[PDB]
Each structure stands twice: as structure tokens, then as C-alpha cells.
């Protein structure tokens, strides 16, 4: 119940600027020197990765030209944030390059800095399909009516009148999402990324049919890849922290949630052939005495 | 037994236009957010995939020049609809392609929409041979007479004098089929495809022979690949639903069906050597009384 | 199996004078306009030498 | 989905006289100077033949 | 068959060209007996 006061950085400074939570001090004695020290074991706790959260920032402008923008917007929001079974393809690792010249004839070489780069994010989503199969319809109709159509290569929305001449710009049929890596307590942001220019790319939903009556019916799983143009910095970290602050937990107790069934339905009460029924209206009790 | 009123979309609109059955409302909270809520578990039921039904729509015109068009046209319908052990190769997945140009020298890029295309169906049927080899004979004679003949590359039906010109058009020796992927109750159609221009292509039936008297005799399976042009959309779904409204299940009950034998056959009744015979004729019948 | 009655030239006149067999009608829609139509694909059958 | 109001020419004039649609301003900062700017990426869309 | 695109969406049109038939390459198998009458038979057949 005690640890050294220098275990946690007093202030988030220098290379820890912009950090949201508590950052361990690297100047505390470590285990891999001469010998491990038990006095500083509180500072040896590890870091474990937690699932990422998708926050939707922008809706496409094409939704306003349909019959119900509320439906399209809400469906996209739920699919991005709540139906996301998995995510993958996010990466902004750095990469350094050097130029090399021999240092004498003996075999040594002299290395000089050349360039620095950054990896690219390729958002990938996975969904599990449901009764009435709404997800495949959502994405197929999105592509067909807001992007090209295979037979003619023209969006099906333009079959209406009055679509603006500026339909070809990305804002018409693209959106933006924010990815955040929270802490174990879900109170601070450790990593954030802001990707835009997002619309379906590559293969669409898997639409296939076949007949085999002896084979057990199976379960479909949608997977889609997206375009992206990502940004990272400290402003994105602040944006992620604000988004995380909007999601408060005070007062929540999953143990004390009210049961989703308050009491048995009326049909059960009428059958009068249960455990309580025998006591209520079968046995006599003249009483007990001594 | 009480789901929320908003689990099922009240009406099919937006991306659900033309849907036949009941489509789940996709703005109900899902289980992959902060926590799942047990009050919305009826909405977690998963889509499960059922076998495809094939309907014959057109017959080749060459059946007319034959001595019996009825038998050809009945055999083709039965083979397509009833004897089809397995079907595969039906696919109309989409595909989107983009073009790129770097957004600076860091590594990022800007992707611009280029084109959208659709997949192609390659129907494959599979059958099991029967006594007399009717399937292999049907298909071999179809190819030989209504299609090229290997030693002359001429249809064998032309040996009759009077065959009309315009025998090179597909309507002479091609047919059409409609495929439907229904729901668990088999009342509403979820996916459909209307392929035409269908006729055998590539390898025909098996046709090998061999001698081995020490081996166990084996069966014969027929695999046939076809050609075709397919259409997809909403009109095809309406056509499929019109087809599936027929073949209604009202009235039938497999459990209550009559047995395929009503009573023992006469020769059995003449032997007089069974269970009932002992009671009826052998045992003494004095009567029991007290 | 049915097709458009205008699929085949009926007279073999103009540039089809002297033809022996049947000739397709060039005035029925082809696939390389705005979009193809599946109602007229019978005229998309091709030549083979 | 919001983009810079100055992304498109207000009037097709100068070298854009007679243009038949929307034309990029060619005045928004490009991506090949000191750095690319993400506030002006809507104008980085490319013509496609 | 031959093939030609039916529009630019990806669908294609297929037409008949030719029909061909397979070819037989018979193979027999025997088991040798005392003496070697089978080998002698075939070798002398070929040689003479």
C-alpha cells in the first residue's frame, strides 16, 4: 500500500508532453541491471492494449438528397460505432532511411541520415449479418446510388433532378471517423488518429448463392475495406480526450442494473399450476401450536 | 415473449426498398459498444443461409423439331428443378477501383473514385446417375444433336430436311433459369438471379471405362457447367416473390401424411404363418370368467 | 424462347442483296451505347469463320 | 461534410470562359509546398478521363 | 466457346465455336507365369 514518490512523473513534460494519464518515470532503477530491486516493483507494471473506439465526426452530404436522411445517418452511426465486431488496418509507424559510404577499406561503413516517413492506415471493418439482412442492403445501395453503377458507371441518385454540379467532390460521398485507444479505466486517451476520405473500396459485401440440402445452414460475416487520409498529433489527442470526457461513468454499476424482466407475464399467472400455486390454493394450514 | 416495438423496421424504405419480409431495425443498440443490454437481445438473432431454388423459365426451340417435344421438355425441367443434387458458382459481388496521388512526401496519398464493376455467374449443376443411364444419355444427345458434332462440327438434327434458317441464334438451343434464396419459412425471397443463354460448356459427362474384377463397384456423378447472362435488381426480386407465392404450404403436414402402404399385401395374407395367425386360428378360445 | 420479330432482316435488300442465309438487323439497340438491354441480346451473337 | 467555400470558382471566367461545369479554383494551397494541409484536401481530387 | 463483353459492367456474352471428343490410349496388364510366355510373346512380336 506504498510506493516511492518518484514512481509517477510529477509533471508530464519533455517527451511526455500532451500525455493525458499518469506516465511512469524511466529514471527509477530497473530489473535488468546488476540485480532486481524489490523496493521499486510498483514501477514495473506493464502496458496492455485495449480495444479501439470509432467516433463518427462527419456524415456524407448525399444523405440530404434522399427521402430520409435521419435513417441513413443513424444507420451509418450505429454501424460505425456499435455494430463494429472488429477493426484492423490502422498504423502510423515511422521509418527512417540512411545513405552509406565505406569508412576505409577494412569493412566499416559510415551512415548518414536521409529521410523519415510514416505508415498508412487502411481501415477494415467486420460485421455479422442479421435477420432481414440489412447490412448488405445498406452498403450495396450506398455504393450503387451514391457511387458508380456497374452497367453505366453513373450514380443512381442522379436519376433525380437538381443534384448539384459539385457532386464529384469527395465531401458528397465520404465521411470521417476518429479512432481512440483508452486506458484500462476508460478515463484517459493513450493514442488517437483522425482518418477522413472514407468510402467503400475494393470488394463489396459477399453476395453468393448455392444449393446443398445436407449441409447445415451457415452464418454470414460482412467485411469491408475503406479509403483514408489520416492525421496524428497533439490536437488529435486533445480531441480524443474531449470525446472520452463526454462519456462519463459516474453512477453506473452493472451489478445493480435493474433486471430486464420486472415480473412474470400475465399468461403465466393464469395457469395456476406452478410451485407457488400449490401452497396458495392446495394445502390446508389450520396452523401450528404446542 | 416481449420484444421492443422498434426491433423490426415498421416499413421498408430507403435502402430496404423492395424488401419482401421483415427487416431488423439497425439503429437498435448492439452488443459491441460499452456494454450489451439484455433488453435488446431479440435484435441479435443472426441471419442464416438457406438452399437455393431453381425454376425453369424457357425451353429451347429445337425440342419442337423432335418427335416428342413433351418428353424433352419434361426431362429438362425435372433435371433442373428436382434432380439437382448441388448448385454453385452464382455470384454478383461488386468491385470498386480508385486512383492515387501522394498528399505530400510523407507517405500519405489521396484516392479518387475510378470505376465500379460486378461479378459474373458460372452455374454448375451436379447429378447422380440412375439405372439405364438417362442423365448421361440426355446430355450427350443434347450436345450431339442440338450442338456441334465432333466429326463434322454440325448439329445432328439438321439431317432432317426442312429445318428452318436462324438456327444459329441462342433461342434455338438455349434456355433460362431463375434462382431464389428464400427465408427460413420459405415464404419471402431474399436474393435472386435471372440467368439466361444457358447451355453446356466445357467438359461433358464422365465417359470412361475400365476393368478390375477385384474392386468394389462404384457410382457415377455428373458435373455440368453452363453459360449465361444474368440480371439483378428489384424487378427480379418481385418476379422471385411472385414465383414463391406459388408453392404455398397451406394445408400440408408431413407428420399427418398417410403411409405409403395401407395394409399388408395379399401374398402375405395367404401364408398363415404369422403373429396374428396364432391368435386367430391356433389358440383355443374357451373364454374367461370368474 | 422468344425474341424480337425485328431481329433478322426480312428482305435482304440494300447492302444485303444477294445474301444466302439470314442477316441481323443493325438498327436494333446494341450494347455499346448508354447501357445494354437484355431484351435484345439475341442480336449480340457473333461471327465465327 | 464541409469544404472550403473558395474551393470552386465563383464564376467561370478568365481561362475558364465557356466552361460547362464546376472548375477547381487553382488558387487553394497545393500539397507540394512546405507541407500538405489537411484543411484543403477537397481540392486535391483529380480529373479522371 | 468464344466471348465478347456485353457492356462495360463486367458481364460477357458467350457463343459456340466447336465440339471435340476425347481419345483412347488403352493399357493392358498381365501377371507373369512359369516360363516367361508373356514377355517372350510380346518381345518376339515386336522383334519379328
Author numbering:
A (entry chain L), B (entry chain G): 2 to 291
C (entry chain B), D (entry chain A): 2 to 50
E (entry chain H): 99 to 146
Give excerpts from the publication.
Like other described contractile ejection systems and bacteriophage tails, the contractile tail sheath of ϕKp24 is assembled around the inner tube. The sheath and inner tube follow the same helical symmetry with an additional 6-fold symmetry around the tail axis. The structure of the tube-protein (gp119, accession number QQV92088.1) was predicted using AlphaFold2 and flexible fitted into the ϕKp24 tail EM map. We used gp119 to build a model of the tube of phage ϕKp24. One ring-like structure consisting of six tube proteins represents an assembly unit of the inner tube of phage ϕKp24. There are two most prominent features of gp119: (1) the long C-terminal extension can reach another gp119 located in the layer directly above (toward the capsid); (2) the N-terminal domain can extend to a neighboring gp119 in a same disc. For phage ϕKp24, the sheath interacts via hydrogen bonds with inner tube: the residue R623 of the sheath protein gp118 can interact with residue D268 of tube-protein gp119 via a salt-bridge. The outer surface of the tube subunits displays a positive charged patch. The C-terminal domain of the sheath protein binds to the tube’s patch via a complementary negative-charged patch on one of its two α-helices.
The Klebsiella jumbo myophage ϕKp24 displays an unusually complex arrangement of tail fibers interacting with a host cell. We observe the tail fibers are branched and rearranged dramatically upon cell surface attachment. This complex configuration involves fourteen putative tail fibers with depolymerase activity that provide ϕKp24 with the ability to infect a broad panel of capsular polysaccharide (CPS) types of Klebsiella pneumoniae. In this study, we combine cryo-electron microscopy methods, protein structure prediction methods, molecular simulations, microbiological and machine learning approaches to explore the capsid, tail, and tail fibers of ϕKp24. We determine the structure of the capsid and tail at 4.1 Å and 3.0 Å resolution.
